[PDB]
Design an enzyme around this catalytic site. Structure first.
Site, short mmCIF file in Angstrom:
data_model
loop_
_atom_site.label_atom_id
_atom_site.label_comp_id
_atom_site.label_asym_id
_atom_site.label_seq_id
_atom_site.Cartn_x
_atom_site.Cartn_y
_atom_site.Cartn_z
CG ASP A 136 0.02 -3.71 2.82
OD1 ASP A 136 0.56 -3.37 1.75
OD2 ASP A 136 -0.30 -2.90 3.71
CB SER A 173 2.52 2.55 6.44
OG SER A 173 1.21 2.52 6.98
CG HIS A 191 -0.43 0.43 2.48
ND1 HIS A 191 0.04 -0.48 3.41
CD2 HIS A 191 -0.27 1.65 3.03
CE1 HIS A 191 0.47 0.18 4.47
NE2 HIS A 191 0.29 1.48 4.26
#
Ligand SMILES: *[C@@H]1O[C@H](CO)[C@@H](OC2O[C@H](CO)[C@@H](O)[C@H](O)[C@H]2NC(C)=O)[C@H](O)[C@H]1NC(C)=O
Ligand SMILES: *[C@@H]1O[C@H](CO)[C@@H](O)[C@H](O)[C@H]1NC(C)=O
EC number: 3.4.21.5
Lengths: 245, 39
Positions: free
Chosen positions: A93, A192, A43
Site C-alpha cells: 500500500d 491513512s 489506497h
C-alpha cells in the site's frame, strides 16, 4: 488520531494533507521526502470499493499546516505501486506524488528521511515506539483543529497476525498498545497515508518507517493499526524517482 | 547520497532534522518517550 494530543509548531514539518480538489475534502495524510516528492498510501488514490480512483487533476496537497506561510500544491503525476491490488489484501500500500513545482522549505516544511538497512534493523523492533501524526477523526466516529500526534509501540509479528484474520505480509507491520496497556491510541479515518516516524538515537534524524495503511476500527483494544513497511519498498521508490523525477 | 538530487530534488542531505528542534538544539515534548523505548 485517537487518544492523541495537539502538535507543537514544527514538530512534524513533513506532514502533508491530501485533498480532493473542490469538491474540497480531506482524503488522507502524506509525507514530504523531498521538495518535489510526496509519499502516501496507494489506497488513498485507488480504492474502487470506497469509490476512489483519482487522477492528478482530482487531488491537491497542503504543506506546512499546523492549525486548521503554508503552501498548496498541484500534482504533476501520481504513481501507485505496480503490484498493489486492492482486490485482495492492501499489500504494498504505497504511492508517490510528484509536485507540479518544487516546494520551498521553511520552519514548517522540511522532508523526513527514508530508512536504510541498518536503521530498520536496529529500530523497527517490537516494543520500540514510533510516532504517527494526522488530521484524522479524533473520534472513531469529529475532526481536529490542530495536527494531532501519538506515539505507538511496534508489535511482535506473531501477535500482529493473531490479532486479525487478514493475511499479514512482509510488507507490513503493526503498532498499538496491548489490551493491558493503560495507554490507548491509534490512527483513524483520515490518517491513512500518513507517516509513522522514528527518531534515530544515532544521528538524531527522523526516519519514516511506515505509512498508515489500515485498521479494524479505530483504537479497538486487542486490535492493532497496520502500516506499509516503507524500507522493503524503497527499491521501487528509487525506480520511480530516477525514472520520472 | 542514496538518491540523485537532479531527479529527487532538494532535501535528502538535511532530511529529518527539524528547523525548530534539532536545528536549534531543542527537543519536542514526547520524543523522550520514543528514546526510552529504544533502551
Ligand atoms: C480508474 O480510472 C482510470 C482512468 O480513467 C481507468 O482507466 C482505464 O480504463 C479506460 C477504459 O475506459 C482505458 O481506455 C484507459 O487507458 C485505462 N487507464 C490507463 C491509465 O491507461 C481505470 O480503469 C479506473 N479503475 C477501475 C477499477 O475501474
Ligand atoms: C501487560 O502489560 C505490561 C505493562 O503494563 C507488559 O510489561 C506485559 O508484558 C503485558 N503482558 C504480556 C503478557 O506481555
Amino acid at each position: 488520531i485517537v487518544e492523541g494530543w495537539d502538535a507543537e509548531k514544527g514538530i512534524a514539518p513533513w506532514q502533508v494533507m491530501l485533498f480532493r480538489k473542490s469538491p474540497q475534502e480531506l482524503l488522507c495524510g502524506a509525507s514530504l521526502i523531498s521538495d518535489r516528492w510526496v509519499l502516501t498510501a496507494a489506497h488513498c488514490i485507488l480504492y474502487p470499493p470506497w469509490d476512489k480512483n483519482f487522477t492528478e487533476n482530482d487531488l491537491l496537497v497542503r504543506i506546512g499546516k499546523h492549525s486548521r506561510v503554508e503552501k498548496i500544491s498541484m500534482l504533476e503525476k501520481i504513481y501507485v505501486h505496480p503490484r498493489y491490488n486492492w482486490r485482495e489484501n492492501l499489500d504494498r500500500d504505497i504511492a508517490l506524488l510528484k509536485l507540479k513545482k518544487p516546494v520551498p522549505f521553511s520552519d514548517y516544511i522540511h522532508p523526513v528521511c527514508l530508512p536504510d538497512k541498518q536503521t530498520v534493523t536496529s529500530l523497527l523492533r517490537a516494543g520500540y515506539k514510533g510516532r504517527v501524526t494526522g488530521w484524522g477523526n479524533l473520534r472513531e466516529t469529529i475532526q481536529p483543529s490542530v495536527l494531532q500526534v501519538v506515539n505507538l509501540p511496534i508489535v511482535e509479528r506473531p501477535v500482529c497476525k493473531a490479532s486479525t484474520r487478514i493475511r499479514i505480509t512482509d510488507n507490513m507491520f503493526c503498532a498499538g498498545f496491548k489490551v493491558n496497556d493503560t495507554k490507548r491510541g491509534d490512527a483513524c479515518e483520515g490518517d491513512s497515508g500518513g507517516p509513522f516516524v522514528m527518531k534515530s538515537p544515532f544521528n538524531n534524524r527522523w526516519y519514516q518507517m511506515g505509512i498508515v495503511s489500515w485498521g479494524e476500527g479505530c483504537d479497538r483494544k486487542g486490535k492493532y493499526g497496520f502500516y506499509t513497511h516503507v524500507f522493503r519498498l524503497k527499491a521501487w521508490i528509487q525506480k520511480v524517482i530516477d525514472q520520472f523525477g | 547520497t542514496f538518491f540523485n538530487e537532479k531527479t529527487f530534488g532538494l532535501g535528502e542531505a538535511d532530511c529529518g532534522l527539524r528547523p525548530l528542534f534539532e536545528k536549534k538544539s531543542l527537543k519536542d515534548t514526547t520524543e523522550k518517550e520514543l528514546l526510552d523505548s529504544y533502551i
